[model samples]
Target: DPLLAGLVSLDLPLDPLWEFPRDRLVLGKPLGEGCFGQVVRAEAFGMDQASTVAVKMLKDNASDKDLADLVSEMEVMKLIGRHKNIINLLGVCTQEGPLYVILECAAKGNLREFLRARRPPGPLSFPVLVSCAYQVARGMQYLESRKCIHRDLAARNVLVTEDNVMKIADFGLAPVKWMAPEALFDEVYTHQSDVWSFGILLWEIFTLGGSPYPGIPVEELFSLLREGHRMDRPPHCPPELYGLMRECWHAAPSQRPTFKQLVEALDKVLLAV
Candidate 1:
């Protein structure tokens, strides 16, 4: 009751249709845990059809700020609507002890981990990396059309489905390394800033999940970025693909390619390779 009361005071704009009955959910194994809370696999019955889902929930004693943050993310997700490349918010169960934000399960887990498995000594095809980047660009293009800005766009925030489809997940960690100059220096986030992060994500994919700004510290990143310094090309990435990455990292946010443009450009790149 306290949770519901507190949530109401926050003036959340979630849709009533997205509220799932708590009784209908059968929780399963733990998926992962984070600073805020943990996610678990579950089966939701009586929803047009029974389905497997991931339930993101806060801890029993989580502070109001944490609760508010999770719910706010749910609201933003609801606003962003559905896209094949974006994680689907199945529903929510608010009339409960711990709030449940149900979502489609990403069987392959996060992209960073997925890419890391392809590190040297392993065989990873170049086309596969381009395909992954293309899907993300398509998804981000959808978000951009809706005027949504994914402030947390990185390899870690990307989810991999059983079919290898990349779905953008609950988007932030300040991810300074992946941030656009405007976002890093002015604390401004926009669709273009998301493009900047996408560039870093591309680097991750090509490098087989290497960290951004490999030798640079967070403290020096701002100054170096201000000086027009960007990460060097990945050993295995094609020059064409790297060119797109540079466009995304353009110093002037407005000068960066739109997600739509990236999608189109990647489409061409995919066809060529």
Candidate 2:
């Protein structure tokens, strides 16, 4: 019944009595690829019905830890599915080889791709950026309210629908609240870590999806972050936005603004226009 509802939302034909057949699972064009896995458009057959879905297939021959991590990610998705700003997790298939996660397809794709395709980059008009920022902050606020910390917040993880609504994705790396107060440099994660990630996300949005630290090495990023380094100033970003981002990257995690404060500030800023 619920599966039928999900299928209908995706504009797929639904059948209440049909059991999904593994052999009928059809993988389509590639959506994106990453080190951990590749996401492909897929269709699942159900008796006389078929539903389109996004299948994120983990790499074959993956390490034991990787397999376990994938399973854990599926569990996390199940836990967070009710939130509107979070991506919908339809179901999972783990029959033969690597796990296959069925997710709601975002036709407009991620924020990174959307920004890249938009021409003539400049400071976004106040109303436009406000709408984008509100969606992002609202998603963050939802996660924060649930004590979930999205450790990997960025443009790449924010999915935009055809109607321009933003939904946060990639919850596999989300950190729990109990770990929030632990000292950094030991691989500990917390809500404040999400605040830090959100700063980067804001920078990406403001800069029209510019690469983070264009020429910096991966090994140097953490060290530079620890030493009070971040993007100097995002090109085509409003001065107020630039200042807000700087505050988000504050050296002390406690100095970072909470999602509650962030939404309030953004509301006021947007209202001024």
Candidate 3:
């Protein structure tokens, strides 16, 4: 995202070891496409192991600002490296004719697509849903600890491993749809704003990746949100789970629970399930 440039500069050490030799990557068909670049399944050896990876390739004619934005993304990923629930940045091709950032492939792909494409073995079980919520809450808690806001926190921005673990992704979008009411009007985005989006993520999970607010268009979502409209509990949603999701969308930023609290709430729900 060009909008991601110059947002935050962490004073952490910049390691040369994370740089990938530009010629080493063997690209496969695209795994996914996004606003900034296409993610491809690639094979890169020399990083101590031969492995398949996801490489985010920066597009042609990327401006200086776009380069900076991608660099910032690498920095953010490196800073938050090696978490169970956050996707890790394995390496990058920053020397650059075409920039590529390598990351571990999430075998099941994006969380929304994973949910939507689930084979009819019956709907995803309640335990699986709670487990995923717990994973995302833990990931967000770590991001909060790192002084970062995952401006886009929704089903689509999360990726799933084959075993169903969730990994947060797409931190650079500065997206509008998942934003909190305070963020919408005041142009403020904080950990609390992310907390609000986590509430909406719960809606997506419970609805099996359903489009938010059924028939409401994006142009009207803000208006509806401003009018105090919140998503109704999806059919068969557990009352306690729905209530926790509701708390996340409380009107005042101060009213929302911290990610730490969310983690605990989801943990309890998971234990009960």
Candidate 4:
């Protein structure tokens, strides 16, 4: 529990409601892993009606820096509060051993895999794709309203629930291809930068999880973007939807559409579908 004390010593913010009893977590198979820790599907009793959850655990013997990084993510989640389109933080267990950040279980897993799985037939209709993008726009709007920039916004960072609802997850970094020019060069990230990523995400959705800039080298893309090159519209993607993507990629951050505006635009797209 020295890390917990260390967090306290460092004056990190803690919400009593987030503190969950370690014994209540019943770990299942590992769902995913990262450099710092692994996530496992688990069951939490006495937290919310014996529900299932995804528990992210820090590696044993983690350094104080890792502790800080993990807690910073928790703080951001707390700040975001809750929205239907964002993954909800169920609880946390930081009083001992490896710390845990319990989160809502996205039974269908990440959106990328979900879309890829149906690719041959591209199971989802265009209207469904528009709806998914609309849902993400709504979620990002909520996050923007809270003044929290989700540096990472892509199909891979979005999770799909059992009923096919898209809930955004994973915060913290921007892939070079998905980043806005200002963010890539000046290291400035804002809600507008997030809009740029959303455009790439929209491409992913319409293309059934296709990668951005299909064949461009990561290094070459930086210059190409500066030269005003953009990805072509995927086949079958609506012209209006592609126009929205173009608007998101506007060179000046000030010129990019806000998430609020994107949400309204997507509503029209959904309606037209």
Candidate 5:
């Protein structure tokens, strides 16, 4: 009963997709794929109008654990809803073998793709970086206010709009209050851990999406961070931004600044820029 109550506290409507008329649902080409499933563009007719959206459909053979994770993510999204700096979860369709989650279409897609496409020139201008940092902090502030810790805060999870507005996306690894404490030292989750991820994201943004530890192998990078060693300097990262990042990636998670403090710090930096 407590688990059910916890789920209910999330206030997620049963099947957010129920409101959409069946006739209007039109699927488009696939946008991307990941361990969970494929994301596709979709169009739904509503109130005599058509709206475009991104739909994440789980793969049929996906393990039950994956489905459970999706359900958790859905619950989290429902709990947060449509905050300005966070992606909007429009609806969900569960009729198919794998669930379909309809979300507001991010025209420019995820930050990773954005960086890959804009490479060579490398890194955004200081003003743009400041703006992005502000938007990200705003999103994190919202999450922190709700006592939610997004375990995977990274450039890949941040989405940009056609007009260049950035929004935080993805919550499969997000943890709430009771789950929060356990996340620390779990090697995968924690508020401070998320901050670490955020720091890495800031580095990505600063370097115009350069890969972290370019020459280092993935296994080695993880080993180094786990052993309390961070990249001495973020590749192509600006000095001031790198400084803030270093604070976030402090070996001791407790030493990192709170989201509130981070927001304030970023605000001051943005103002001075």
Candidate 6:
């Protein structure tokens, strides 16, 4: 009972009506891993006996501090609720130990991984690629409008559903080594920083899963970035798209376009495609 008595009883900003029973969840396969932990497929009668879901379970013996942060992210999801392009949270199974954050399953998997395997069999069309970017922009637009800054917006954090829907994922407070330069150096993460991350995501989309700043060492990444080293356009990349990428990477944060502007830019490309 020490855990219960000593537990930090901060009120969860989640609705009690949305809480699901833990026994109702039936875990399945390991979907994938994130920097923080692993995610697995699962079923839940609480959501429904037929509905499949993903559960991001904490590693064993998680520090109390980290656990607090995990739950905070869950509350953030609850606050965000359901958006078409943002991953939806189904419910949560949290009590004494082994915290679980249940989410709607993304059948296709990570967007970046999907892109890597995309061209091996056949070339992806311009519309298809732009569609992916458009969806991400739309999602971020919604999130940014709400003052929720996603510190990580790379393709790695974006997920794809079975029917080719793109969802913005991973709204957590973990340290991001490869995120916006301001956040990397000064630890400042505003909506503007997210705009910078979105630019990198645009680089990922254009390069078809190419790593950002290839051949550059991680330690010198910030130094190079501060020295005006930006990513180059991949061959055959559209001029307008690359222009938007540059606008996002502007050294002054205020100079960067908001998610609303990003959506408009991507929408123009999507319309052309």
Scored by CA lDDT, what does every candidate get?
0.84, 0.69, 0.80, 0.84, 0.70, 0.80
**What's the candidate order when arranged by decreasing TM-score?**
4, 1, 6, 3, 5, 2
lDDT of 5 by residue, 73-140 (tens): 76677777568888877877654333667778888978878877876641466777778878898898
Report the CA-based lDDT of candidate 3 relative to the real structure: 0.80
10 residues in a row with least lDDT, candidate 2:
174-183
Q: How badly does each model clash, as a count of residue pairs?
A: 0, 0, 0, 0, 2, 0
Q: Give lDDT for model 4.
A: 0.84
Instruction: Please provide TM-scores, in order, for all candidate models, with all chains considered together.
Output: 0.89, 0.73, 0.85, 0.89, 0.76, 0.85
Give the residue spans of candidate 6 off by over 4 A: 1-15, 21-24, 46-49, 58-60, 94-99, 121-123, 174-178
Worst 10 residues of 3 by lDDT: 3-12
What tens-digit string does per-residue lDDT give for candidate 3 at 24-101?
Answer: 778888886555566788888876567778888656555556666777887777777578898888897655345677
As a whole number from 0 to 100, the lDDT of residue 76 in candidate 3 is 71
Model 6 misses residue 85 by how many Å? 1.2
Cα displacement (angstroms), candidate 4, residue 138, comes to 0.7
Clashing pairs for model 1 are none
lDDT of 1 at 28: 94
* Backbone clashes in model 1: 0
| Number of the predicted model whose lDDT against the real structure is largest | 4
Q: What is candidate 2's local distance difference test score? A: 0.69
Instruction: List the candidate numbers ranked by lDDT, top first.
Output: 4, 1, 3, 6, 5, 2
Stretches of candidate 2 off by over 4 Å are 1-27, 43-52, 57-67, 93-100, 121-124, 171-184, 218-223
